[PDB]
Design a binder for this molecule. Sequence first.
Ligand SMILES: [Mg+2]
Ligand SMILES: [Mg+2]
Ligand SMILES: [Mg+2]
Ligand SMILES: [Mg+2]
Ligand SMILES: [Mg+2]
Ligand SMILES: [Mg+2]
Ligand SMILES: [Mg+2]
Ligand SMILES: [Mg+2]
Ligand SMILES: [Mg+2]
Ligand SMILES: [Mg+2]
Ligand SMILES: [Mg+2]
Ligand SMILES: [Mg+2]
Ligand SMILES: [Mg+2]
Ligand SMILES: [Mg+2]
Ligand SMILES: [Mg+2]
Ligand SMILES: [Mg+2]
Ligand SMILES: [Mg+2]
Ligand SMILES: [Mg+2]
Ligand SMILES: [Mg+2]
Ligand SMILES: [Mg+2]
Ligand SMILES: [Mg+2]
Ligand SMILES: [Mg+2]
Ligand SMILES: [Mg+2]
Ligand SMILES: [Mg+2]
Ligand SMILES: [Mg+2]
Ligand SMILES: [Mg+2]
Ligand SMILES: [Mg+2]
Ligand SMILES: [Mg+2]
Ligand SMILES: [Mg+2]
Ligand SMILES: [Mg+2]
Ligand SMILES: [Mg+2]
Ligand SMILES: [Mg+2]
Ligand SMILES: [Mg+2]
Ligand SMILES: [Mg+2]
Ligand SMILES: [Mg+2]
Ligand SMILES: [Mg+2]
Ligand SMILES: [Mg+2]
Ligand SMILES: [Mg+2]
Ligand SMILES: [Mg+2]
Ligand SMILES: [Mg+2]
Ligand SMILES: [Mg+2]
Ligand SMILES: [Mg+2]
Ligand SMILES: [Mg+2]
Ligand SMILES: [Mg+2]
Ligand SMILES: [Mg+2]
Ligand SMILES: [Mg+2]
Ligand SMILES: [Mg+2]
Ligand SMILES: [Mg+2]
Ligand SMILES: [Mg+2]
Ligand SMILES: [Mg+2]
Ligand SMILES: [Mg+2]
Ligand SMILES: [Mg+2]
Lengths: 200, 130, 160, 122, 67
Amino acid sequence: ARYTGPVTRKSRRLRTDLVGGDQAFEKRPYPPGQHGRARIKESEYLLQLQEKQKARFTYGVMEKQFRRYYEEAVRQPGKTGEELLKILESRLDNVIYRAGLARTRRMARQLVSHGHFNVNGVHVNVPSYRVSQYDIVDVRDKSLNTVPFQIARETAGERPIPSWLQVVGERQRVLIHQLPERAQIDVPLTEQLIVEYYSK
Amino acid sequence: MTDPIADFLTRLRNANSAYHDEVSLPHSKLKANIAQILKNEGYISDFRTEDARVGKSLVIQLKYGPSRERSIAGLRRVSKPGLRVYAKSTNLPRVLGGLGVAIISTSSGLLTDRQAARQGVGGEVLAYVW
Amino acid sequence: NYLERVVAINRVSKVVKGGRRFSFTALVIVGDGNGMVGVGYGKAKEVPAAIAKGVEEARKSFFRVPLIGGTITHPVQGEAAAGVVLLRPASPGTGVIAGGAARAVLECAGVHDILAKSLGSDNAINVVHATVAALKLLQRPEEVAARRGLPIEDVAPAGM
Amino acid sequence: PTIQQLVRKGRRDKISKVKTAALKGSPQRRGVCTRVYTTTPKKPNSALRKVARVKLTSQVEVTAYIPGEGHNLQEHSMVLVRGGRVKDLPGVRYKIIRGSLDTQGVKNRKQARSRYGAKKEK
Amino acid sequence: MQKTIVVELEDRMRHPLYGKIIRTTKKVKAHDEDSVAGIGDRVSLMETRPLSATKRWRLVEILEKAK
RNA sequence: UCGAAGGUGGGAUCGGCGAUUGGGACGAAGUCGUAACAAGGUAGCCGUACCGGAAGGUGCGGCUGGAUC
RNA sequence: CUGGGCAGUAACUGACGCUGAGGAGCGAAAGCGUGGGGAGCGAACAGGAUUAGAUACCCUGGUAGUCCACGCCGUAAACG
RNA sequence: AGAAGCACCGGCCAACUACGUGCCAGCAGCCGCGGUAAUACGUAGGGUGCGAGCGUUGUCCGGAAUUACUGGGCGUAAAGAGCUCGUAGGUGGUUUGUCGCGUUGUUCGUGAAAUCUCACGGCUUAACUGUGAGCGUGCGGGCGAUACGGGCAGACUAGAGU
RNA sequence: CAGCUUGUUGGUGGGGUGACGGCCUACCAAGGCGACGACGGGUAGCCGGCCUGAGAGGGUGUCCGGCCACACUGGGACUGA
Ligand SMILES: [Mg+2]
Ligand SMILES: [Mg+2]
Ligand SMILES: [Mg+2]
Ligand SMILES: [Mg+2]
Ligand SMILES: [Mg+2]
Ligand SMILES: [Mg+2]
Ligand SMILES: [Mg+2]
Ligand SMILES: [Mg+2]
Ligand SMILES: [Mg+2]
Ligand SMILES: [Mg+2]
Ligand SMILES: [Mg+2]
Ligand SMILES: [Mg+2]
Ligand SMILES: [Mg+2]
Ligand SMILES: [Mg+2]
Ligand SMILES: [Mg+2]
Ligand SMILES: [Mg+2]
Ligand SMILES: [Mg+2]
Ligand SMILES: [Mg+2]
Ligand SMILES: [Mg+2]
Ligand SMILES: [Mg+2]
Ligand SMILES: [Mg+2]
Ligand SMILES: [Mg+2]
Ligand SMILES: [Mg+2]
Ligand SMILES: [Mg+2]
Ligand SMILES: [Mg+2]
Ligand SMILES: [Mg+2]
Ligand SMILES: [Mg+2]
Ligand SMILES: [Mg+2]
Ligand SMILES: [Mg+2]
Ligand SMILES: [Mg+2]
Ligand SMILES: [Mg+2]
Ligand SMILES: [Mg+2]
Ligand SMILES: [Mg+2]
Ligand SMILES: [Mg+2]
Ligand SMILES: [Mg+2]
Ligand SMILES: [Mg+2]
Ligand SMILES: [Mg+2]
Ligand SMILES: [Mg+2]
Ligand SMILES: [Mg+2]
Ligand SMILES: [Mg+2]
Ligand SMILES: [Mg+2]
Ligand SMILES: [Mg+2]
Ligand SMILES: [Mg+2]
Ligand SMILES: [Mg+2]
Ligand SMILES: [Mg+2]
Ligand SMILES: [Mg+2]
Ligand SMILES: [Mg+2]
Ligand SMILES: [Mg+2]
Ligand SMILES: [Mg+2]
Ligand SMILES: [Mg+2]
Ligand SMILES: [Mg+2]
Ligand SMILES: [Mg+2]
């Protein structure tokens, strides 16, 4: 399923904005509910749950998919949180967001779900697809010169580009040199609390 | 009087706890070999065998650090006569995650964990000296 | 610039002539979050004075902990009057796994990879005492090398 | 202790007492629900808990508990019974499902809307 | 046994759980074409076809005769 | 000859009900006593015997998990 | 008449040692069977006294028992 | 434009206000709330978590180191037979030689496939599936060792006995 | 559940089997099994596997795969490799 709900309410509940974009702030403090302006005792489980929910609502990941990602990360050798973050980043919506072909993660998911991207010249419609090394991503030839793409074609130069991805000009092609490093690009959230959450 | 290896370990542990600077016990070849291993590992100082009224007695001198500090952290017999402990090369026991030494009785003689792993032959883990 | 967490808070009662007398004891664990940890029992009429006394006692009783790169060197098994908690080194990827008191003490000390379990009593004070005792029997490879000789009979693949 | 003695006489896990004796293997058992009445719980509750004598298809007679605000129960009735503890009554260890073959869902139910029986709206 | 002998055999097998080494004694029936064997009389046995209803061993040789 | 099934007989074992009857657990705000916790008003327990509405009492032997000079 | 222990010499054998499932023996007092004995004490029982009651504590008595012989019983806070 | 609901909000454990009620209606896994200001009852709003699923029931594992080899205790919390002897059994002083049964190493055969894991390949992805290697804790056979236990043959006096 | 067995244990000579064999038969011996639990009672398809557990372990044998046992109940023969 999908959230399809107020992102700002979730941001106020989590006490940390994680979407930005045009609607970054609500010009007000964060009482998410009727009693949201009252102070609450910070329990140990609360911090870990809030961190996990922040990550899940930042990357648009359902609970079961996040569970699978975490279990794959911990089962993989080396670290666990870094592998989990790398798996989360390897999603098509995140890759499009980092390459600046969409306004936010929700826009990237909308476009990839509606099927406006051919990775190796092949139609896909799943944001759950994971990129790999030496993998190309290309835009549908028919879908070019459309409004949702031409609106960002000229104003996609504001957000930075990560050190693992690269973008192409007038004809955009997205290529994956190697796996990302979220620990050094765009880590607003500590995974060492999620790894402790998931071991309870 | 069963398990003279255990008796030797218990005597050494008691003397180390009581800050004794000298121990005495009847001598055996196994105890002499264990003393050699301990001296090589550096947990003890020199040892010698002296002829008592009956048989021979093996003598171990202990070592202490700068303050009244004991080089020997503790002792623990492993292969009790009630249940023998045998270990192979692929699964040799680890003491203190490598900071401890376990005596291994293999066909090459009495050997430490790392040396026995180097030559790939296992046996009976006498004790942990760590 | 210290990190503090309270472990247990409870109210005691002592019978007096006219009625009831109450007091508050609150154990507080204080540290800088890298290698320093402090334990303070504390006791006063009011909770603020109690936790202040606990913080002061922790500052007084600060003690050194041996680290090898975010985790302990070798597994340890401490024992308090009644608490029984064992600590084991873990992979750097793994976080901190412990109960309330043990996790609080470890995070105030500054350990990032540790496997802890309680096997004795479940009293918070005794669990804290067992954990800090295990931290005390924790030794350094350089110290054991000074004790024996030839600082080569040790494994530190992480190094640094 | 004494590995030889352990070899001679090994360890044994604690004895176990089953909790679904009346159902004897069924999460829900279809009963008869005869003689619906009301009793009083333990001393520091002072209530009037609605109970019934329901005999299952497994042919056992137990006293069950009726949750919700009122009931349409009567003499022998086509009911379903599930397990549950009441913590106030002496020996009531089963609960009748509300919204079953015969009994109706509890009317005016808006919160939790599944227990005691409640359709959303229609 | 009128051309048969009964021989006690023992073996040691490690306990599956406790790990102690224990000794268990068995009993087999061995064929003796010429019945010359007394109490004790250590014998090495090699196992054959089903010579009888309960005989699956035959006499090989006599070693370490009874004291 | 053997041989399924069946009949006859004395037994073996496992359950259900049973007039009547013994002890147990829980209930309420009942009746009769105060045996224990203070030297609890005759110190308390342990084994046995006897007695009495009941708790209990007495004798024999032992312990302090009580005290005394 | 008989058991055990300790000390000394090392005189002698030469691991013949430790524990011990079951099993066996011993095992306070009270009690049981058979015969004897019975001073004193003393359950049960009786009378007196206290008390609302007193099937008790106190007093006066008093049976088995406590004792011996041979058996039985195998139980104690048989506890360091 | 044709498409979302579900459970909980006192501690365990993330989620509070008001209305009606006043040991009654009632809820509940424990302990505890309701007998006139209920974050615990029914309701309204608000919040939390999940999602075409969410809660209850049924059973198993874990927490439980409360059957403890790993990984428990037995003076007073549950736990040393009333004591002794002794059958089987378990266990055993120093030293020499032999065997190599236990022990351990190598090699060979076997330990089916799928399924468990690493690494890849294909269904737009995943589930699903194919391949290479681990797994298959073991067993049988040959070839190396006697450091310890053990079998045999001896020796000593310290144990023990006289 | 503390004593179980008499073709039962063994041997001999025949018979029988594709094949060894009390598998069957005639004769001889008194033997064979049991506290490491026979005999008796309750329960149950076994395994590769599945679940939980850090692990050891605890639970389980359903998809699928290997085998075994059965075809209304009980018993029997024949054809045929
Ligand atoms: Mg889904
Ligand atoms: Mg505990
Ligand atoms: Mg144990
Ligand atoms: Mg023959
Ligand atoms: Mg009746
Ligand atoms: Mg009284
Ligand atoms: Mg009295
Ligand atoms: Mg009185
Ligand atoms: Mg009194
Ligand atoms: Mg009387
Ligand atoms: Mg008495
Ligand atoms: Mg007396
Ligand atoms: Mg001599
Ligand atoms: Mg003895
Ligand atoms: Mg005995
Ligand atoms: Mg007497
Ligand atoms: Mg008499
Ligand atoms: Mg007489
Ligand atoms: Mg009278
Ligand atoms: Mg009198
Ligand atoms: Mg008199
Ligand atoms: Mg009489
Ligand atoms: Mg007697
Ligand atoms: Mg005595
Ligand atoms: Mg909470
Ligand atoms: Mg109200
Ligand atoms: Mg509510
Ligand atoms: Mg459980
Ligand atoms: Mg367990
Ligand atoms: Mg315990
Ligand atoms: Mg007591
Ligand atoms: Mg006790
Ligand atoms: Mg005793
Ligand atoms: Mg006793
Ligand atoms: Mg007794
Ligand atoms: Mg013996
Ligand atoms: Mg012996
Ligand atoms: Mg020896
Ligand atoms: Mg022996
Ligand atoms: Mg693929
Ligand atoms: Mg395989
Ligand atoms: Mg081999
Ligand atoms: Mg002597
Ligand atoms: Mg015959
Ligand atoms: Mg014949
Ligand atoms: Mg069956
Ligand atoms: Mg565990
Ligand atoms: Mg059939
Ligand atoms: Mg049919
Ligand atoms: Mg049939
Ligand atoms: Mg044919
Ligand atoms: Mg034919």
